[PDB]
Write a protein that binds this ligand. Structure first.
Ligand SMILES: Cc1cc(C#N)nc(N2CCN(S(=O)(=O)c3ccc(NC(=O)c4ccccc4N(C)S(C)(=O)=O)cc3)CC2)n1
Ligand SMILES: Cc1cc(C#N)nc(N2CCN(S(=O)(=O)c3ccc(NC(=O)c4ccccc4N(C)S(C)(=O)=O)cc3)CC2)n1
Ligand SMILES: [Mn+2]
Ligand SMILES: [Mn+2]
Ligand SMILES: [Mn+2]
Ligand SMILES: [Mn+2]
Lengths: 230, 230
């Protein structure tokens, strides 16, 4: 089985979500062929040089999974787009592109965070375009850490769902009948049409009282919710 | 594993849902310790004497599961409250009460359809009280089938969510930390408090483009959505 998760929004303020994630990495994840994390692993990221102890606890847990023989992969979310090659090295995770077309036991699946599909949000997309410009990233990252923290705090003081056409267009660009994403925090299986055939869009949930994952096997694709009852 | 499903709303008009259900009974269900169907198996029911061919195709498929060594159980929904002992015999299913407290590998779980929790719907509950009165049922069922059909058709020409307090009260009456239901067609895992401890309410989805089930093992409880991709 290949596993997909997203929208953990991990942070110092929410230790119970972190514990649920650590339990998942130590249990479920070890049995998998691979683990894909489709963005918003962290609630925020201002650079890999951040000494936040949570960051190292998380990289250390993911690295254990990778070292146990289960490749882990990452696609950036809107929250954690500044996750970089240094974290990748610490965690053993491989950074992937904003869209990837996978071959899962012969089934072709498109994966992404899902924020790019939300084309009705002009505000978000203007923001995204700027923070995805390399020289704007390298500017922000060249500031002293204490100034990056002030910038984030000052920003602080509902997520728009996908545009249906944008979904079709993406599945048609990749010629696939399967899409897995998060971002929208609306866990669901959807049926549609793409490439003249039936297609499915499987949406992951955010981690709060529950976790969620998509499990892909040779014959099946399942969206699973689990409570943190341990 | 023990499996829970609900809200299939099976009907002549929707053969693709019926095929998804038959595939599930022939595959997934055969591997289980038991199968519980928590109501709204059928979109409508006007009595067991109805010769609708769908009714016999469904009973025959469920009976195969029971005969293969997997007990099947049923709790009535609002739609199919007139399902009776004759169908039970045809299907091999055991009829259970509107609330049951189960022991699943040491875990105590409350199961029900969920309509009784929806105490904000005065209209529904007035209806329910009447159609659950035995002598009102036996009156309706004593009519000729052709008159029962007219009555249903004439009735034809959104589902209220649960009352949060009603949920707590039910879990507290049974002294349980686990509740599984359907009815509301809002598949989700919810955390709450009952009996002074953390509790979980696991809600099944309706079958249309997807199926859903709750899988209970010694150590885990999972809500699973599956598309009908075969
Ligand atoms: C390179 C660059 C330049 C400048 C500078 N100066 N600033 C930064 N960020 C880095 C990321 N951090 S963050 O992690 O705390 C963060 C903060 C806000 C968002 N905002 C959004 O994602 C967003 C924006 C618009 C509309 C919707 C949005 N999301 C959907 S939402 C509702 O979750 O916030 C994302 C990450 C804030 C500072 N980066
Ligand atoms: C014993 C008795 C007496 C009389 C007579 N005369 N009539 C009957 N029924 C049997 C059931 N059939 S049914 O299966 O077609 C059916 C029809 C309507 C409902 N209505 C509701 O469930 C309902 C009613 C009020 C508010 C909400 C409701 N549901 C939530 S909903 C929106 O799904 O319909 C249920 C079953 C209709 C006739 N039974
Ligand atoms: Mn998110
Ligand atoms: Mn996001
Ligand atoms: Mn229903
Ligand atoms: Mn119902």
């Amino acid at each position: 089985a290949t596993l997909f998760i997203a929208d953990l929004h991990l942070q110092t303020e929410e230790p119970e979500i972190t514990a649920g994630f650590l339990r998942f990495l130590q249990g479920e994840a070890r049995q998998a062929d691979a683990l894909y994390i489709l963005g918003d692993l962290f609630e925020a990221w201002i650079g890999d040089d951040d000494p936040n102890p949570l960051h190292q606890q998380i990289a250390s847990a993911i690295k254990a999974v990778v070292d146990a023989g289960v490749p882990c992969y990452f696609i950036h979310g809107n929250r954690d787009f500044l996750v970089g090659q240094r974290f990748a090295r610490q965690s053993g995770m491989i950074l992937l592109a904003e869209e990837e077309r996978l071959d899962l036991y012969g089934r072709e699946v498109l994966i992404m965070h899902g924020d790019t599909l939300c084309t009705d949000d002009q505000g978000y997309l203007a923001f995204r375009a700027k923070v995805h410009t390399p020289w704007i990233q390298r500017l922000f990252l060249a500031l002293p850490l204490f100034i990056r923290h002030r910038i984030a705090a000052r920003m602080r003081a509902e997520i728009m769902d996908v545009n249906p056409q944008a979904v079709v267009d993406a599945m048609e660009r990749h010629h696939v009948q399967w899409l897995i994403h998060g971002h929208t925090h609306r866990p669901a299986v959807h049926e549609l049409q793409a490439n003249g055939q039936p297609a499915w869009r499987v949406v992951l949930g955010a981690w709060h009282s529950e976790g969620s994952m998509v499990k892909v096997t040779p014959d099946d694709v399942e969206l699973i919710h689990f409570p943190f009852h341990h």
